[PDB]
Design a protein around this ligand. Structure first.
Ligand SMILES: Cc1ccnc2c1NC(=O)c1cccnc1N2C1CC1
Lengths: 543, 395
């Protein structure tokens, strides 16, 4: 079934040359087979015999045929990326019916660039000359075979498409999803028309009596032409569990977390701690049991949704799950979800809820654009005043597409706010810290207008941990209202940014402290100058 | 006849991935492109071409119609190689979009492959539509060049017949400056419009803005401290700035709110610093052989400060930008605008785009800038974290 479609002109990487490998032996059997097989293609037109001028070659195999172009591929020009982008269900638009014509023979039926064919020479094995041919069609396992096959497919489909607008087609590897809004017979008919059109170019495709049937299973879902369902997920019931098992279980469970509300894996993941081998077995803790059981139940209830209706608007709503964790669901009509998902806390350096929500919103906007070409109207668990307050004061450019407040607690708020001006009648701490960078020994202390004072020596600390430390002590030994003046820009920055989550313990401590206080004003002054109380602590935390 | 063009030795064509676009903008392109295809400006390409360049669509809101824009930054960088102080002084300069002229000229076959780009599809329903240029592509550095000849001619008339005017070309943009009061300038331009057809800016107002020091009736410990810091920092630019007398008024562990009178010497020291700050620092000169840099800080409330400099603490020009006419509460909007304005001035003054340092997160910028861009060119940029210091200063 060879195609009479113009071949795609191929070439070898700049200044390279065809493969010149040699094959010596194979059994009488392995030679008998190949001789037969070839003779077959030989006649079909798939391959041809070459002779006089072909200095190229490759090892042929017999597996109970196979030709390895590993080397040829290395010397083959690069082609245009096949594109990893995949349609996601929530993107699809309702149809009446949709079949999947399975091509298969696909590639092996596509003409190989004439010129390039020589390079595709291979020999059959102990007399004198053996058996030599070269490929005449896109060879199984060759570099450009995928790329080239799809382009060809697309050309062949281009007219048919233009004549059948109403008809949608999705080319995926070796399958054709064709759906439409025509009635049951008109459809079945067009598929047929489509088939002869394909068969009209050497592209054999199965008849109505052999194509696969709906719903089709796709990257996780079970989908029909009017709705879809999360193909239900089962958890293996077992006596003993190996690490490996546990791990896969977490993956399944993790994937489920997107669609299924309430899935958990805390105690299950705990089991991995310390593991010495994938084959190791772990006594499933009772707590793991309770959780595993619990998830099994959650997985029992079927969940299904619908496709996108261009004639309606998208609405994305977000919830604050834990600290840094967020759930979101997208819909066109209440409770009729199009897609849902969850985002794990991106534990980073030092951030805060409003920033984090901002990212979630950003991630979603991006995803949404990819799927629908539009961005949803957002419903956010944050007060408009909160957002105003935060953004108009955050050093970094930030933004949220049009959205509206939805009072669905817990809401995201600012855990504390630094004073704009010094507090009248509150103690003033002139904190300072510093450590020898060669030994990592340091001092961090403070002094105040109220005479108070304190200092502490530290081991293996670093400069920045010292200055942070200094502010911690101040925050500690201070009471409800404080004025703190540091000469550390690091600290000023960090804190000035009103962080409510960090991976550094000290920073967490400080944050906690900050939330505790009633009023806090942080100020900064140049270090090592004659300036104020700074020159006092400067002297006390020396080296 | 088309001049041959080659990539710098050893280099290969861009293979930049395509950004996902809005429906709105996807349609615009198929339209724009089927047209360009018919006219034969561009043509569909095969899978044997592995190169790619990002494309998208904007509208200089000088129209409501959409315009196609290709990001050749990468390509331009990989392309072989081959300005008047006038307008820099002119009373007024106007910019003209001549991108078009290029489409009149064919592109060297062997080079076309490199200009490959891709119109995407939503949800990936389909593969994108791939095209490659047959004429000189707008936004490509090679174009203005090759079109040089044809360009100079076309102009010459209006040139030596209006020598009291300066005409500069940068990519798809033509900068025309004259001292003629608005009346003659505006008409002389339209006069030039038709001339090309047949085939507001104000330079001097851009000076290194002054550093101003605050004046209070009464000063608190806080106040002084804040002033000493700014001054201190400022001493990097003006080594003559002293802060001794003020550092005195602060010694001892006083409460931040405590008011402090200024010793006559503190007074002087201060008055002396105000004076020093009355003029940009000496010895600052544009070095052609070094990259221009533009840095911007979000001051908030709609404001944005910035500095064009080549070496640290030796600013060539500094400025501020505030939001005029049009409820704009959208930072990204503002920042893109801000960046354009600035790249523009660079071009005028030095005729070179500056390398930007942006106070925003990659992810955010990438997801929306395109939505507000309105220029045929695209500068280079990187993302950063504003040191609160540098901010309170230019504030
Ligand atoms: C896997 C896939 C990818 C892209 N689109 C579709 C499909 N498959 C379908 O079964 C499908 C279901 C509902 C709507 N469009 C669908 N089709 C469209 C082609 C008719």
């Amino acid at each position: 079934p060879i195609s009479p479609i113009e071949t795609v002109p191929v070439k070898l990487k700049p200044g390279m040359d065809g493969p010149k490998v040699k094959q010596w032996p194979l059994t009488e059997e392995k030679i008998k087979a190949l001789v037969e097989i070839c003779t077959e293609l030989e006649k079909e037109g798939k391959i041809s015999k070459i002779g006089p001028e072909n200095p190229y070659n490759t090892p042929v195999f017999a597996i109970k045929k196979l030709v390895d172009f590993r080397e040829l591929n290395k010397r083959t020009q690069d082609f245009w990326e096949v594109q990893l982008g995949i349609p996601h269900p929530a993107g699809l638009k309702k149809k009446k019916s949709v079949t999947v014509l399975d091509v298969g023979d696909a590639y092996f039926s596509v003409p190989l660039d004439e010129d390039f064919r020589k390079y595709t020479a291979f020999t059959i094995p102990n007399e004198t000359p053996g058996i030599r041919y070269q490929y005449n069609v896109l060879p199984q396992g060759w570099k450009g075979s995928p790329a080239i096959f799809q382009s060809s497919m697309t050309k062949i489909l281009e007219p048919f498409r233009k004549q059948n607008p109403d008809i949608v087609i999705y080319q995926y590897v070796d399958d054709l999803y064709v759906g439409s809004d025509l009635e049951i017979g008109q459809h079945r008919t067009k598929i047929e028309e489509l088939r002869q059109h394909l068969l009209r170019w050497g592209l054999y495709t199965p008849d109505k009596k052999h194509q696969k049937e709906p719903p089709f299973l796709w990257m996780g879902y079970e989908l029909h032409p009017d709705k879809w369902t999360v193909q239900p997920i089962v958890l293996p019931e077992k006596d003993s569990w190996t690490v490996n098992d546990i791990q896969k279980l977490v993956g399944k469970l993790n994937w489920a977390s997107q669609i299924y509300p309430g899935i958990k894996v805390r105690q299950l993941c705990k089991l991995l701690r310390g593991t010495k081998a994938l084959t190791e077995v772990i006594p499933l803790t009772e707590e793991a049991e309770l959780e595993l059981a619990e998830n099994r139940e959650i997985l029992k209830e079927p969940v299904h949704g619908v496709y996108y209706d261009p004639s309606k608007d998208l609405i994305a709503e977000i919830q604050k799950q834990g600290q840094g964790q967020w759930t979101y669901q997208i819909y066109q009509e209440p409770f009729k979800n199009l897609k849902t998902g969850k985002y794990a806390r991106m534990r980073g350096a030092h951030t805060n809820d409003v920033k984090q929500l901002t990212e979630a919103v950003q991630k979603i906007t991006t995803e949404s654009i990819v799927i629908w070409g539009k961005t949803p109207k957002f419903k956010l668990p944050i007060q408009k005043e909160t957002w105003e307050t935060w953004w108009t004061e955050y050093w970094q450019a930030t933004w949220i597409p049009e959205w509206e407040f939805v009072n669905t607690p817990p809401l995201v708020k600012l855990w504390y706010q630094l004073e704009k001006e010094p507090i009248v009648g509150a103690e003033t701490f002139y904190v300072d810290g510093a450590a020898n960078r060669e030994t990592k020994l340091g001092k961090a202390g403070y002094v105040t207008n109220r005479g108070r004072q304190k200092v502490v020596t530290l081991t293996d600390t670093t400069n920045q941990k010292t200055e942070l430390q200094a502010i911690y002590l101040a925050l500690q030994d201070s009471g409800l209202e404080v004025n703190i003046v540091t000469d550390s820009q690091y600290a000023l920055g960090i804190i000035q940014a009103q962080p409510d989550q960090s991976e550094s313990e000290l920073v967490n401590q400080i944050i906690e402290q900050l939330i505790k206080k009633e009023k806090v004003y942080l100020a900064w002054v140049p270090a090592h100058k004659g300036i104020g109380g700074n020159e006092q602590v400067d002297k006390l935390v020396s080296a | 006849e088309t001049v041959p063009v080659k990539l710098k030795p050893g280099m290969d064509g861009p293979k930049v991935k395509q950004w996902p676009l809005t429906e709105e903008k996807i349609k615009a392109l198929v339209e724009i492109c089927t047209e360009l295809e018919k006219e034969g400006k561009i043509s569909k390409i095969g899978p044997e071409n592995p190169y790619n360049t990002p494309v998208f669509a904007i509208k200089k809101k000088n129209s409501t119609r959409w315009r196609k824009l290709v990001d050749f930054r990468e390509l331009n960088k990989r392309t072989q190689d081959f300005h008047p102080a006038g307008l820099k002084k002119k009373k007024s300069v106007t910019v003209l979009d001549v991108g078009d002229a290029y489409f009149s000229v064919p592109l060297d076959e062997d080079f076309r492959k490199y200009t490959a780009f891709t119109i995407p599809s939503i949800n990936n329903e389909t593969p994108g539509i791939r095209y490659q240029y047959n004429v000189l592509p707008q936004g490509w550095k090679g174009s203005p060049a090759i079109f040089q000849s044809s360009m100079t001619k076309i102009l010459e008339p209006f040139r030596k017949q209006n020598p009291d005017i300066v005409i500069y070309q940068y990519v798809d943009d033509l900068y025309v400056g004259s001292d003629l009061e608005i009346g003659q300038h505006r008409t002389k331009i339209e006069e030039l419009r038709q001339h090309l057809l047949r085939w507001e800016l104000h330079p001097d107002k851009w000076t290194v803005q002054p550093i101003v020091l605050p004046e209070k009736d009464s000063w608190t410990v806080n106040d002084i401290q804040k002033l000493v810091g700014k001054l201190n920092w400022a001493s990097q630019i003006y080594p003559g700035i002293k802060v001794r007398q003020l550092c005195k008024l602060l010694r001892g562990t006083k409460a931040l709110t405590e008011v402090i009178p200024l010793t006559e010497e503190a007074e002087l020291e201060l008055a002396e610093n105000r004076e020093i700050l009355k003029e940009p620092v000496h010895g600052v000169y544009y070095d052609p052989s070094k990259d221009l840099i533009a840095e911007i800080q979000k001051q908030g409330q709609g404001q944005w400060t910035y500095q064009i400099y080549q070496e640290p603490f030796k600013n060539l020009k500094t400025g501020k930008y505030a939001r005029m006419r049009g409820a704009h509460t959208n930072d990204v909007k503002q920042l893109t605008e801000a960046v354009q304005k600035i790249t523009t001035e660079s071009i005028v003054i030095w005729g070179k785009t500056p390398k930007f340092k942006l106070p925003i997160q990659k992810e955010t910028w990438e997801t929306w800038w395109t939505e507000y861009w309105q220029a045929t060119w695209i500068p280079e940029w990187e993302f950063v974290n504003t040191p609160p210091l540098v901010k309170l200063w230019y504030q």
